[PDB]
Symmetry: D2
Subunit: 288 residues, 4 copies
């Protein structure tokens, strides 16, 4: 049961990526039980990162671990291809991309051709990043049956949808990307790619371990807490909230996100800490 | 009644922008009655264009006309600010941006702050580009009441939604961006920003003129034809279809779009021409 | 350009239909220029009415006029058929039905069979009542080409959707059901079936006559005020608000709606009346 | 972990409910391990049933068992109240209702008042039937904190939505209604109210018992086959397919559904039976 972290990309006050905080943060997650790192995913501001930034994120993480899934999506297939050729030169877990996005009403064959070109050029295992709420498109198994897919990261609240990939694509690994369904994913899928692993890795790791021991109720109870957190963070902007919580829960600074993904202001950050305090107490009591 | 064209960005077979075709195309549209050009909009592959490409599009068009609305949106407010400072040095109609996109569940204050920063730095009239089907966010008048908005381009099938801007924001110009509602927009709003002006400008211009003369039925009949075209193009990918039709209807080449906005293949292009032929006949009979 | 009214169904405080009030109201409506009355539509609480209540509404109204379109939808086709046979013996304009509702994921063929059965038994002109937002289903022209459809009431905010019927179904009368698009419908379709005709019939009849005279600015001005009323009524429940407003604008009691469509409390009614006061004065200053 | 069955309502070819078939079916279901029967739910064509048909279903079933949850929803609260007073004199598990439906844009307070009225008169435990996809409304815990709710059936694909009830409503029993999430519900909620219990009760009772024994791999394997059945039944209409399958799997006639919920034709029934043959053999090879 794989616990993958869509690692955040630390930015400094001027919006420049801080590769040193990225490395510090990555080491801590690995050390705390995270099995692999999804680089440049939604949580790492993927589509907000230029091609050079995506590449620099992979280079910096490659010093910490080779268990990296490199997300290379952009609205210019040339830049996507460039990153792929670059990644073929490295020893990583695989390359990934979300579907084309923004543009509405694109034919389905456009989605199929995009990935088909990634597969033609890549020498790495293909990981499909399916996030309909973000891209506006759901990638069905129809399209994937041709491609040499190794894994699918499915950010979707419908578990049967994730499970349908398992069913229709023998051999492919499926991981659900929702924080509020971790428990369920660990009881049916090949793992999770959950953003909350950035600030509470030991908690998600504890869920997996409790499930391996057969203590579901303990795992479920931890999910209640995770879900209550989810509700609180929505108000402040989840991704921007995570930056604050990584400092609070893990003891080191990971900077700020980059606008339009606005950082929480000091009044907002303090308001968040006050509001999650009761949940933090409960968590650190059941996990440590 | 303003007829604005979200001009396409011509790309060559290698995906490099062709500024010469852009200039040729722009001259023809102006010559045929288009009042202003929306640069780097959805139809011009805005979010697919790098900041340098957005700038090069404005520079090239600035030789043809100063009636330019410069769209500068990207998922890095620094790059957005850069383009804005650059545009303040020029004599244009204004600067515009769609809302932040891709990232779902961003607080509303994030949308308000993004535009508020554009307004703080820009010395040009602010044009709000509202396209919910593409960005995932609807920009309500609540947020715009603070900002110094000159115009709103509202791509939305609900005309009452566009008309609500008119109502709630005295003095602001509102233009609807739907091809299938042109007729209605010309009878209630300040104009249109319609993608179909790229290949049938004389037709949309004719609608406005027939309406100024009081010949609504003639304008409406032209809308029937436009709508039938809309249905046919959806199948092939509207934006990609437009590139083919600009050659067919206007007699000059505007290249191809850039993948993931895939160009129509030769079999698809011929299939499109065969399928719209009856509509072209009818159009050129009522317009010339 | 026709103005059809989806007349409300007056109920007394015990949830019993008030036939006397229904007749007095219809009488006023026809006198004020309403072209026809649509019985048991959404505004008349159609699906909340029993077989017999639908029947007794037609009977009550048949003592007042012959310009009636009889909606007979329910989730038991046997009951729909009974109502159809009942109306076959009456000299009214036509019979109508919205699509099956509530049940999600019903195959399209079910929608076709529902209507084919109505057409097979009805000796009256068929009126299709399309209200996707209420039923969860959109009736496409595909299905309608097989049926002897005379008219379509399309309650849809996409005016292009209503306009598409005109194109694919030659000779069929198309009316749009939105109050916020009345102006546009009178400029392109066969008419409107708007709930607001219940309390401001003269206003909508004035829009029709002003447009007939080429005074579009004055008709659009009235539309702006209608759309402002629409925003206000949503807080209170539109159908429920209409009852209070009929009394307020027309001078007679039309009773109360029947819960789950709750009547406005005394307090809510005064609140409503205060909000619309400024709009009522501007309206009564332009109409008459 | 409880397995509640939303029992279908058998109709004869004339659209008359077949009480004898209803009793024979319920009898088999209880014998096969079903914990309780939910009467007049969606699967039982609840909203398509008249006041009297709902009543006669409860009466028929009351001669067979006392484990009945009585759903009484209609769009006339007077009728809902009558049904509630009727059931007050019967020794059943509880009374239930889905939210008002059809009418869009009804204020939330209407939903609260609908339920407050039921609670004010019912002398039975209250069961909230939440089915946003059918009614167009989601009942939030906000409303439920004021009511003496004993249970909630949540037909929702977001398992997190069902789980949120457990959190905000201590002591309330929560069941999920999806067939495709049965496995997950049995691992986190109080049970399931799944339509498939009608034709494969032993399969779902087996999942419950396997999970009770810690054999999750075997319960998930059965879930995979259930989800494949779900895909197949959608083509034909799930509720309508269930009738054919009950006969096929259980050995007795449960008649036909009543149109607009059309029965499968002879041809469609054979087609359905062929598609599910491979799945039936794999199922009957794992159950018994
Ligand atoms: Mg009579
Ligand atoms: Mg008895």
């Amino acid at each position: 049961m794989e616990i993958i972290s869509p690692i955040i990309t630390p930015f400094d006050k001027q919006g420049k990526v801080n590769v040193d905080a990225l490395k510090t943060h990555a080491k801590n997650l690995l050390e705390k039980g995270i099995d692999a790192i999804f680089v440049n995913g939604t949580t790492g501001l993927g589509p907000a990162l230029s091609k050079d930034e995506k590449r620099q994120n992979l280079n910096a993480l490659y010093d910490v671990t080779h268990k990296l899934i490199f997300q290379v999506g952009s609205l210019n297939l040339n830049d996507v291809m460039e990153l792929v050729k670059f990644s073929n030169e490295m020893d990583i877990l695989g390359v990934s991309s979300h579907s084309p996005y923004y543009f509405p009403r694109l034919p389905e064959k456009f989605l199929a051709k995009y990935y088909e070109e990634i597969a033609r050029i890549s020498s790495h295992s293909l990981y499909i990043y399916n996030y309909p709420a973000a891209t506006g498109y759901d990638i069905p198994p129809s399209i994937l049956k041709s491609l040499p897919v190794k894994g699918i990261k499915d950010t979707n609240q419908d578990l049967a949808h994730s499970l349908e990939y398992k069913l229709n694509l023998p051999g492919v690994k499926v991981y659900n990307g929702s924080n509020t369904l971790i428990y369920y994913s660990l009881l049916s899928l090949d793992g999770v790619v959950a953003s909350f692993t950035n600030f509470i890795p030991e908690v998600i790791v504890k869920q997996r371990d409790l499930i391996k021991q057969g203590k579901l109720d303990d795992a479920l109870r931890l999910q209640e807490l995770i879900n209550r957190l989810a509700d609180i963070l929505r108000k402040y902007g989840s991704i921007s909230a995570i930056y604050v919580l990584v400092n609070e829960f893990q003891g080191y600074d990971v900077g700020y996100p980059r606008p339009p993904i606005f950082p929480l202001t000091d009044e907002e950050a303090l308001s968040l800490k006050r509001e999650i305090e009761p949940l933090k107490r409960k968590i650190q009591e059941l996990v440590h």
